[PDB]
Amino acid sequence: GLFGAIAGFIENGWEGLINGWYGFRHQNAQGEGTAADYKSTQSAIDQITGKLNRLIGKTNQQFELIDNEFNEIEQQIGNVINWTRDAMTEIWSYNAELLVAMENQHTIDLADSEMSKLYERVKKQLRENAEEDGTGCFEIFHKCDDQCMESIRNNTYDHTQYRTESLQNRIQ
Amino acid sequence: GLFGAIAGFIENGWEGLINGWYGFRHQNAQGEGTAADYKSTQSAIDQITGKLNRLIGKTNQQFELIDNEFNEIEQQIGNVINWTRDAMTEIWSYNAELLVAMENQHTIDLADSEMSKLYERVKKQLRENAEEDGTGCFEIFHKCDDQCMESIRNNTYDHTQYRTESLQNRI
Amino acid sequence: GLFGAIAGFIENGWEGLINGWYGFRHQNAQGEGTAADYKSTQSAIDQITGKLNRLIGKTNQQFELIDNEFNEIEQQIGNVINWTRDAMTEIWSYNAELLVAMENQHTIDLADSEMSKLYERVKKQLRENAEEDGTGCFEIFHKCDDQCMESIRNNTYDHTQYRTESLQNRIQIDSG
Amino acid sequence: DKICLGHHAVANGTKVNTLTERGIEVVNATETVETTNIKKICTQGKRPTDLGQCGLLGTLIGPPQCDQFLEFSSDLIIERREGTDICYPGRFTNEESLRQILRRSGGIGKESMGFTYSGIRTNGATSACTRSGSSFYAEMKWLLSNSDNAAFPQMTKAYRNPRNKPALIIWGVHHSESVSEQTKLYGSGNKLITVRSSKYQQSFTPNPGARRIDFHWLLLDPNDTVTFTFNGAFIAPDRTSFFRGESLGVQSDAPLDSSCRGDCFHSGGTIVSSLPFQNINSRTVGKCPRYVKQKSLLLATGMRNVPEK
Amino acid sequence: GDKICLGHHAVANGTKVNTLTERGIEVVNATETVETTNIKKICTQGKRPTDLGQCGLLGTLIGPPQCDQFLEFSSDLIIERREGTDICYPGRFTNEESLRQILRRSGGIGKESMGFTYSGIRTNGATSACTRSGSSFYAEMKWLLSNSDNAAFPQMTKAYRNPRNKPALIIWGVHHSESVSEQTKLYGSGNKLITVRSSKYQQSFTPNPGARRIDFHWLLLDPNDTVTFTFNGAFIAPDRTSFFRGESLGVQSDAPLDSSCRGDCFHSGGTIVSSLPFQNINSRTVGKCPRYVKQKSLLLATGMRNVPE
Amino acid sequence: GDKICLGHHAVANGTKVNTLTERGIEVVNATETVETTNIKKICTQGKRPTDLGQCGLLGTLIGPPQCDQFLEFSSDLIIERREGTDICYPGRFTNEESLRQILRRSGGIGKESMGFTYSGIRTNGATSACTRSGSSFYAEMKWLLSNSDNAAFPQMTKAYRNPRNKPALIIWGVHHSESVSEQTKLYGSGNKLITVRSSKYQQSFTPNPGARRIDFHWLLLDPNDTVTFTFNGAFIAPDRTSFFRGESLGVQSDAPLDSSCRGDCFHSGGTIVSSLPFQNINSRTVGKCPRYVKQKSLLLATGMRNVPEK
Ligand SMILES: CC(=O)N[C@@H]1[C@@H](O)[C@H](O[C@@H]2O[C@H](CO)[C@H](O)[C@H](O[C@]3(C(=O)O)C[C@H](O)[C@@H](NC(C)=O)[C@H]([C@H](O)[C@H](O)CO)O3)[C@H]2O)[C@@H](CO)O[C@H]1O
Ligand SMILES: CC(=O)N[C@@H]1[C@@H](O)[C@H](O[C@@H]2O[C@H](CO)[C@H](O)[C@H](O[C@]3(C(=O)O)C[C@H](O)[C@@H](NC(C)=O)[C@H]([C@H](O)[C@H](O)CO)O3)[C@H]2O)[C@@H](CO)O[C@H]1O
Ligand SMILES: *[C@@H]1O[C@H](CO)[C@@H](O[C@@H]2O[C@H](CO)[C@@H](O)[C@H](O)[C@H]2NC(C)=O)[C@H](O)[C@H]1NC(C)=O
Ligand SMILES: *[C@@H]1O[C@H](CO)[C@@H](O[C@@H]2O[C@H](CO)[C@@H](O)[C@H](O)[C@H]2NC(C)=O)[C@H](O)[C@H]1NC(C)=O
Ligand SMILES: *[C@@H]1O[C@H](CO)[C@@H](O)[C@H](O)[C@H]1NC(C)=O
Ligand SMILES: *[C@@H]1O[C@H](CO)[C@@H](O)[C@H](O)[C@H]1NC(C)=O
Ligand SMILES: *[C@@H]1O[C@H](CO)[C@@H](O)[C@H](O)[C@H]1NC(C)=O
Ligand SMILES: *[C@@H]1O[C@H](CO)[C@@H](O)[C@H](O)[C@H]1NC(C)=O
């Protein structure tokens, strides 16, 4: 999309992330693990819900019969009605298709945006303790156990705690 | 916000910033200081003005009376007109609702974009002399007086002048 | 643009880049050189073409005459017809104006997006071996000859190869 | 050690269209075009009237078929294919205008206008309108001369609207079978019917040659008066109609069902949907999703699907 | 340590707007796009208005007393009023609304004599229904009749060529007497026949006695074309014909005129003065108007997302 | 030292377009979405056109001398001309415009004898207004009148059942004489009534004498349904009825035919050949056409923002 993450620098999606829309996949000495990010996922869902609240369950306005199936009306009025109705149909068909096309373009870009935001959040969080590898991953230049990995997802990671160690590894 | 700056990593706006739309707030050995950025502010205002030019002061089509308020016209034709008119009401009501919704979505994202562009401008400007807070702030690793702060604002800051000082403060 | 590259931090376009939409201009000991980027150019074209497919060559809607251009029909029904037609003209002129305006906004921003994407992609490739000057260039902190430049363009650049030379030129202080 | 960011995907996504792409695959999508029709008239919550054999306009004048519908009260008037307005040949002028007023009328209440006669007949009947022998339109009086070829006297009957809502006035012009048929029923020579109010005048002459009774009508304002002047060939109203409230008129071959609720109707039944559009019927009545030509228009409700390889 | 922080402005008290994604999200500033502010007047500044009042628009052609002051008039804004009437003697125009539509945009009418003079008949037909310091008639018309009770009205032919650059609005009347004997009184005895003929129009009229009315009929006569009248009684003849001046807008209202406001969008209850693209004031308008919408308010954002301190 | 720069293309002079926020912003390339190029001809290539010329479309049903060459015709593109005339004898079709609309899309017409034979009346009613080798009449019609001046025209009944698989276009005329005397001469004295009845249609007609004319009326007769004519005079009877062939377009235009260009969108000023979504040429069009818009130009950006070099 417009933001370059989903279907961009991030190769593909994870089918095993049944717990949310976006997430983290860590890798340390204890093995790998996957956790879903609530905040980013809920943000995306709320926006799609927004779209649904707009389009679904609207209060339509009343229309009556203006012609007759059982007793054909005078030919002149009838033809004008047929001409008007069909032209309405053409406008509404146009409007409907455009609406969906436009909304979908925005939805995909919206989802891509939320991925980009989350990625960028982690980057700013990790400061000088990590380098981005270009596939959406962050190479941590210190040792980060399951609790440490937690503190990144949890957004409670104190970069000062790990800074000196990681700078030594980045430079050597 | 598609760009995640306004109502994103920037916690809130500044009610004290009566100067413009976007700005800088700095801390040093001389106290706090707030100033507006002209370039970005004007860029956002100019675009919103652009939307208004499109919607306001439009020339319209002339429409005549096809109906009679004082003398009821044949109900056959009357009901057709009323049907058409109501259908037009249904179409324009939709168009109008969608137009405003779509425009508002964009305006919000557009403004957010300008904030991010300004923040990114400053990031590239500061090079290896600063680090990101995460809240929209740049932690400067050298002593930056009021003149140094202004240089950052009006894009004349020379990162070379402070690089040696910054890097050794960063270890 | 929404992404701040085109008409943004990149000062201006290159009139000499006739081989594509997006490109690389390098400077090294061997000289200057310009090359197009295919992946980014074609992604922007495919998206534009997509728009053209939606609007050009469509199956048109069917039309029939309800008026008489030789002998005016009765005034009343004739006035109703004109009224309805003009209303249709009003709707379609609005649709057309808006569609085109909305598309052009997205189109410009889309193209800007791709420029940003290609820029960020290169940024990620170079890792800790280069810095952004703020004008759309990366200052490379190691000798990068024509082949090295090539490896950046075709995405085969291995930053590990050049890291030690780079950090020596980047971190120009004593490390204790 | 490393932390990697990513997003969900499914094996089988849903293809949707965007501004730049056709059939791009997303995680999930929802239909916006309703295509499920209920082949019934959903009458739950309503007070429906199925006219059946009775034509909507027949309810006003009362041929045998509409004896059951002289006074109806409904909010959903269902017209059927087999409905006829007449028994004796003829037709209403501006017939569709009158139907359109009736369909939304909320039903009709009848009230006696109170016309009495002397020196003439009021017992006019026909074999075409059979109702236990030979009879006529239940709300109409057929006026003749006292015997064959007798003179019909110039007459004036007037009705003032007592109620606080408009009254529907109907009257008939009997066109005789032949020139001498007209003189047998009524007087000799030229016949004329004048109908006046504060905002309506029109005169009527009979045209003999093909037997028929044509019906004409007007809407009389509160406290206003209809003046009838006639010397023959005149079918007189015995009762007038007052509208009850609000209703919705439907034309359909669909059966009524009082166990489903609905608000949008068409000839093929009821459309029940929260969706913005429908591909079911371009001609609908009531509160409906807008008709579109497309069978399906999928709105994306998830990200771009990029599955694992 | 020193730091520079980036941010944006905000107000404590923002405006709630709707997006595609969110209902009632707070932005810094927003401007209305739906006009709801009406002016309960017909704004006539910069315009040349004609307030027809008691005169009905069609009356301007035939000239009942109500329309004496509008026999000729020049306007770009013709205003019709509920109390306006076209006639003094009972009767109606043929295709009345069609005529009203061409006249509303005529830019006013200029009158011209048709040069009809008569011999061997009376020209001074008058009625107490059209009073003008006594019994009078339609100002633009002549009621033709025999020299005395029951005298034969001579077979006549009257022709008029349109000597003008633009089409002439030709009018004539048929007089339907109260009785046959009355028709015999005013004109001769026997069949009465009126034929009107141009190169595009052909139609013959016979009076229908019993009715007591003067019905008007009309045609547009092309330049250099000729209208020929053939009659032997019951004919209400034109003395004058009409010519349109240019362009105008027709307005139907009960709102007083106001020379001190300017507008180009008019309706039943006044004038809409606005630059906004939409209006929720009246669905029925004339002139250059914002498009009617059923929403009271649709706020367009003119500022960023508002996030207070 | 060494450096690599990322950038994009530009041109010296780009094309101005409009966006949501900006007016006349310059992009690298753009394309027109509103068609303004008209072809001043009716493009008839790959079609079977019918240039009606002197003959009015409605005339093809009743058949005045000018429509002799069109009494039966087969087309997919019917071209009506300004000089076209439906009649010879004075008169008009009732509902003429809705009948024209039906005929324009008919695909042409085929004629079949209704098989009405007559006894005790004259059948050879003619007029010098319809000259065609002397005084003739409408080719598909029959002017019925009494055996001699003033004789009583007998009360009569004629019925025709549609024997085909498609609707029959039934046509009839009412003759309005110059005067009461002339009606009496042709059809006998007394009043006249014409009644036309099918299982869907029911109308009565009385002649209104005063000015010579024959007015035409019509109905569509369903397959297997019967039309019944009852009349004692002033009746113009059908001899043939019409059956439609398939599908066609009808244009009103004075534009010449051109068999060297293909087209599917037509109007009074010729042919619109376009693959564009909109057009500013004509609001009255027939066929497969772009939607009419009031704007002359709507340039769609097919490139990025143009930022020329300095
Ligand atoms: C209660 C009663 O019957 N009283 C009558 C009274 O009607 C009558 O007055 C005159 O009656 C004649 C009948 O022929 C007309 O109706 C007169 O109406 C006028 C009018 O409308 O003003 C007079 C006018 O001069 C006439 N115009 C002419 C002759 O060109 C018209 C005209 O004939 C009709 O409108 C045509 O339909 O009628 C009316 O005054 C008197 C006799 O004077 O006798 C009382 O007993
Ligand atoms: C100046 C003058 O007085 N000249 C007369 C002239 O009128 C007359 O010619 C005949 O006039 C009659 C009308 O009275 C018809 O118009 C005759 O023509 C036709 C026609 O072609 O239309 C002839 C045709 O045979 C008739 N068709 C019939 C009988 O079926 C029709 C028909 O009657 C009418 O059209 C119906 O309205 O009329 C025309 O020749 C001659 C006498 O021949 O005398 C001159 O001095
Ligand atoms: C409806 O509008 C059309 C034009 O849009 C009118 O048709 C013709 O317009 C032309 C040029 O403007 C005039 O020269 C003619 O006088 C009009 N008639 C014909 C037969 O070409 C038309 O008059 C309008 N309809 C009504 C009922 O007013
Ligand atoms: C994908 O979207 C569809 C809507 O098309 C969802 O289907 C609904 O599921 C809920 C239960 O969660 C039911 O109550 C509804 O009846 C379903 N609606 C329709 C129209 O079928 C579905 O939940 C979504 N799937 C996922 C995995 O989110
Ligand atoms: C209009 O369309 C309806 C429905 O398709 C059809 O039954 C009818 O014949 C048409 N009316 C006219 C006047 O063409
Ligand atoms: C159309 O609507 C108006 C009110 O807007 C109403 O007065 C009129 O009666 C309606 N016309 C018909 C034919 O029902
Ligand atoms: C914002 O919009 C409002 C309402 O349209 C206007 O009155 C106001 O002056 C504008 N500007 C500010 C700063 O509030
Ligand atoms: C520019 O646009 C035109 C159509 O407007 C098109 O023919 C062409 O392919 C485009 N590209 C170039 C390079 O001219």
Numbering used by the authors:
A (entry chain D): 1 to 172
B (entry chain F): 1 to 171
C (entry chain B): 1 to 176
D (entry chain C): 11 to 142, 144 to 158, 158A, 158B, 159 to 220, 229 to 261, 263 to 276, 276A, ...
E (entry chain E), F (entry chain A): 10 to 142, 144 to 158, 158A, 158B, 159 to 220, 229 to 261, 263 to 276, 276A, ...
Q: Which sentences did the original study use to describe this structure?
A:
The two membrane glycoproteins on the surface of influenza A virus, hemagglutinin (HA), which functions as the receptor binding and membrane fusion glycoprotein in cell entry, and neuraminidase (NA), which functions as the receptor destroying enzyme in virus release, form the basis for defining subtypes. Hemagglutinin binds to sialic acid (SA) glycans present on host cell surfaces. Here we report a detailed molecular analysis of the RBS of the HA from North American lineage H7N2 virus, NY107, including glycan microarray analyses and structural analyses of the HA in complex with an avian receptor analog (3′-Sialyl-N-acetyllactosamine, 3′SLN) and two human receptor analogs (6′-Sialyl-N-acetyllactosamine, 6′SLN; Sialyllacto-N-tetraose b, LSTb). The overall structure of NY107 is similar to other reported HA structures with a globular head containing the RBS and vestigial esterase domain, and a membrane proximal domain with its distinctive, central helical stalk and HA1/HA2 cleavage site.
For the avian receptor analog, 3′SLN, the electron density maps revealed well-ordered features for the Sia-1, Gal-2, and GlcNAc-3 in the NY107 HA complex structure. Structural comparison of NY107 HA binding to other, H1, H2, H3, H5, and H9 subtypes revealed that 3′SLN binding to NY107 resembled binding of the other published HAs. Indeed, the terminal Sia-1 moiety is positioned almost identically in all structures, and forms the majority of hydrogen bonds and contacts with residues in the RBS. Published avian HA structures with an intact 220-loop form very close interactions with Gal-2 of 3′SLN via residue Gln226 which is important in receptor specificity and host adaptation. In the NY107 HA structure, although Gln226 is absent and no other residue occupies the same space as Gln226, Arg220 does forms a hydrogen bond between Arg220 NH2 and Gal-2 O4. Interestingly, although there was interpretable density for the GlcNAc-3, no hydrogen bonding was apparent between the HA and the GlcNAc-3, which is consistent with other reported structures. Thus, for binding to avian receptors, the trans conformation of α2-3 linkages is essential and perhaps only the first two saccharides are required. In the absence of the 220-loop in NY107 HA, upon glycan binding the long side chain of Arg220 compensates for its loss and is displaced 4Å upward to form hydrogen bonds with receptor analogs inside the binding pocket. Arg220 of the HA1 chain of NY107 compensates for the loss of the 220-loop, by forming hydrogen bonds with Gal-2 from the avian analog (binding was not observed in either of the structures complexes with the human analogs). The Glu at position 186 is close to Arg220 and may interact with Arg220 when binding avian receptors.
